């Protein structure tokens, strides 16, 4: 009927005095037209899920804010989410940004200062919501520069919110690149 | 040091008296030059291997791959030619093509077996923290600009990408992990050589 759905995993907070780790490197980065880098409805953080062959399972993470659900284009490619007792339908989304909006337009405004040390609210599969601080590094692109979080989490975390000391959501996890060592590193995609 | 590594998990074999299932959608699809479909020293023993990175939750299955005639094959989005430790030693990526969405390590591509056109196939899905299964289905196709391309309607977790579909004679007909979802949400995977 509608394979996918969301289930929530807490409200968005800043863990004061949480744990800190991360390389914070500055590195220069291309950007494909597909969004690749190179060289109901209650405010809260949800998990995107799918009823599959091995039954139910987490394909990514999205955040719910003022009536509107926000995740990453590659996670849903605007499929329909069966949120609560009713359906939930795409409104807008751009593949190069790698982002999607259900029910309304993009509601998330705050931005990385180039000063603040940020906080990833990771929500990995079969695991509980975790907060974690880091000095983000940077993605030196030809047009603009993007804040970058050196944090290796597993598949299905993609679309976890990155945060400001305020508690504000300043972009999403799980679009990035890997270094030579294999270490993962994500863009603060906004 | 070299986060990413692989671990063998068993033999590629066909398995008769397998559980049989799935649809066969003949569908109308096309794919950009980035690879995305869109709708309208280290040891190299044969068999199927799981792929692992070593991140902030320990060690997790990024994907899956097949290992044959001295060379490792998996999806390109899984590694993007990231180096892979195996046993005592490394495997450097040899060849690649993001459009196909493939990569080969320590030698060129080796798997030459290709879609029957008409005959049931088995997915040897090796999902994360779970038990490699064999499951059969009759493929649909994706009809395209550049001709028909076989595909299977088999919905499996993130991290099974790279895992081999194969023929009645165990010949790896192509990997799992690139595909698109029907309106419904259901995943459907192109079997990619
Ligand atoms: B995600 C996953 C979350 C990050 C965890 N993965 C790690 N550490 N290996 N993100 C990715 O897999 C992204 C996916 C992506 C798809 C499409 C586009 C638009 N062209 C952008 C990003 N891939 C990468 O970041 C990546 C980088 C370098 C090498 C390989 C892959 O994604 C899908 C599901 O949610 C599973 O988790
Ligand atoms: B796979 C993963 C297999 C899990 C299938 N998901 C569900 N929900 N049943 N496949 C994908 O995530 C691929 C990733 C991909 C990245 C980059 C490119 C660049 N051309 C192509 C493909 N994406 C899709 O198949 C897809 C389909 C429909 C909607 C969104 C995404 O397992 C581990 C990792 O995720 C890598 O692949």
Sheet harboring A130-134: ordered strands across? A130-134, A118-122, A161-163, A169-172
Question: Nearest-5° angle of CA A178, CA A181, CA A185?
Answer: 30
What are the chain A neighbours of B183 within 8 Å (beta carbons)?
79-80
Could you please report the per-residue DSSP string of A25-54?
A: -EEE-EE-TTS-EE----SEEEEEEEEEBT
Alpha helices in B124-166 (DSSP H): none
Q: How many CB atoms lie within 10 A of CB B3?
A: 22
Residues in chain A, how many? 190
Residues of B with CB under 8 A from a CB of A: 1-4, 21, 32, 34-36, 53-57, 60-62, 79-80, 82-83, 125, 127-128, 130, 135, 154-159, 180-181, 183-187
Residues 6+ apart with CB under 8 A from B73: B65, B66, B67, B102, B103, B104, B105, B109, B110, B111, B175
CB contact under 8 A, B185 and A156: no
Q: Is A89 helix (H, G, I), strand (E, B) or coil?
A: coil
Q: Which of B42, B54, B44 is nearest to B8 (CA)?
A: B44
Asked whether the CA dihedral A153, B55, B127, A74 is positive or negative, the reply is positive
Q: Which residues of A6-34 are buried (b: 16+ CB within 10 A; e: fewer)?
A: bebbeebeeeeeeeeebeeeeeebebbeb
Question: Which of left, alpha, beta for B57 (phi over 0: left; psi -120 to 50: alpha)?
Answer: alpha
A179 within ligand 1 shell (Cβ under 6 A): no
Q: Are B165 and B174 within 8 A, CB to CB?
A: yes
- Method of structure determination: X-ray
Q: What is the largest CA-CA distance in chain B?
A: 47
Q: Quote the tokens at residue B14.
A: 């066909």
Q: How many CB atoms lie within 10 A of CB A47?
A: 23
Q: What value does the CA radius of gyration of chain B take, rounded to a whole number of Å?
A: 16
Cα dihedral B159→B165→B169→B170 (10° resolution): -20
Residues 6+ apart with CB under 8 A from A20: A117, A132, A133, A134
- Scanning the structure block, which residue is given the tokens 């914070």? A24
Q: Which of B165, B35, B160 is nearest to A53 (CA)?
A: B160
Q: Which of B96, B12, B86, B94 is nearest to B44 (CA)?
A: B86
Q: Are A162 and A150 within 8 A, CB to CB?
A: no
DSSP code for B118: S
Tell me how far apart the alpha carbons of residues A50 and A81 are, in angstroms, rounded to a whole number: 9
Q: Which of B174, B167, B155 is nearest to B111 (CA)?
A: B174
The ligand placed nearest to the CA atom of residue A54 is 2
Sheet harboring A145-149: ordered strands across? A26-28, A137-140, A145-149, A184-187, A176-178
Resolution value in angstroms:
2.7
A74 is annotated as an active-site residue: yes
A158 is annotated as an active-site residue: yes
Q: How many CB atoms lie within 10 A of CB A52?
A: 20
First-residue to last-residue Cα distance in chain B? 32
Q: Are B119 and B167 within 8 A, CB to CB?
A: yes
Tell me how far apart the alpha carbons of residues A159 and A76 are, in angstroms, rounded to a whole number: 10
DSSP code for A35: S
Q: Are B8 and B45 within 8 A, CB to CB?
A: yes
Tell me how far apart the alpha carbons of residues B150 and B180 are, in angstroms, rounded to a whole number: 13
Q: Quote the tokens at residue B11.
A: 């033999």
Could you please report the per-residue DSSP string of B123-135?
A: EEE--TTS--EEE
Asked whether the CA dihedral A97, A99, A105, A109 is positive or negative, the reply is negative
The ligand placed nearest to the CA atom of residue B161 is 2
Q: Are B26 and B188 within 8 A, CB to CB?
A: no
What are the chain B neighbours of A154 within 8 Å (beta carbons)?
53, 55, 57, 60-62, 159
Cα-flanking dihedrals φ and ψ of residue A115, to 5°? Answer: -130, -60
């Amino acid at each position: 009927m509608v394979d996918m759905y969301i289930e929530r995993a807490g409200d968005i907070t800043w863990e004061k005095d949480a744990e800190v780790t991360g390389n914070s490197p500055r590195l220069d980065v291309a950007l494909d037209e597909s969004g690749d880098f190179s060289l109901e409805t209650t405010d809260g953080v949800y998990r995107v899920m799918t009823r599959g062959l091995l039954g139910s399972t987490q394909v990514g993470v999205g955040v719910m804010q003022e009536g509107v659900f926000h995740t990453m284009w590659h996670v849903t490619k605007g499929s329909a989410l069966r949120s609560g007792e009713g359906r939930l339908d795409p409104y807008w989304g751009d593949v190069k940004q790698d982002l999607v909006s259900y029910c309304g337009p993009w509601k998330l405004d705050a931005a990385w200062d180039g000063h603040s040390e940020v906080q990833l609210l990771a929500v990995p599969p079969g695991e509980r919501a975790r907060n974690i601080q880091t000095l983000p590094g940077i993605f030196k692109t030809k047009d603009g520069d993007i804040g970058a979080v050196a944090l290796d989490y597993p598949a299905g975390t993609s679309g976890s919110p990155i945060l400001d000391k305020c508690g504000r959501v300043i972009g999403l996890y799980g679009n990035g690149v890997v270094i030579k060592n294999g270490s993962y590193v994500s863009a603060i995609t906004q």
